[PDB]
Amino acid sequence: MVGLIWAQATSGVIGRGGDIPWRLPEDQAHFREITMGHTIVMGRRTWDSLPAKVRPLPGRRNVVLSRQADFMASGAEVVGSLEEALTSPETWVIGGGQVYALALPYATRCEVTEVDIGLPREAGDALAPVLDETWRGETGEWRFSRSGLRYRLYSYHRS
């Protein structure tokens, strides 16, 4: 079970300036809920952008993809090929752009959060992985977060 999880604006933007371009505590809780107790897979650059205080993300098997054999990722494990990361009974790829792309052909599930905000793509923006017509699933109802930011959840799957 290889899966991809991400949160995007409507336009497909999932990150800008090194930041998630919105505040959505319901997304963080959603993310935790899907991935808790399973393996998470991230690129080295993504681990590098998490505060030392927060990494590894707790209650989950943290795997970090890197070419550097000497890479220090305390509390996590480091693998040097996509094949080796995607082993466990249930894996969620959590970022970033290179790892999303890399892992796409192996994915049979996506969990997405679409956030109702109009952010036309700009050069440099991190972008959601592109879903083709092989996918099927549920595009859920719009929902107001506590702050009044609107978001909805996709739950898609394939062979």
Ligand SMILES: Nc1ncnc2c1ncn2[C@@H]1O[C@H](COP(=O)(O)OP(=O)(O)O)[C@@H](O)[C@H]1OP(=O)(O)O
């Ligand atoms: N095919 C591959 N094999 C091994 N490591 C890879 C890989 N593709 C990407 N990576 C790692 O994953 C990193 C990318 O992580 P990321 O997906 O979080 O980056 P970004 O935020 O730019 O999309 C790459 O820099 C590379 O790490 P190192 O720079 O430490 O080598």
Ligand SMILES: CC1(C)N=C(N)N=C(N)N1c1ccc(Cl)cc1
């Ligand atoms: C919190 C957030 C944005 N939310 C969802 N739905 N999916 C992810 N992969 N996330 C995410 C989690 C950890 C990291 Cl390092 C990056 C993005």
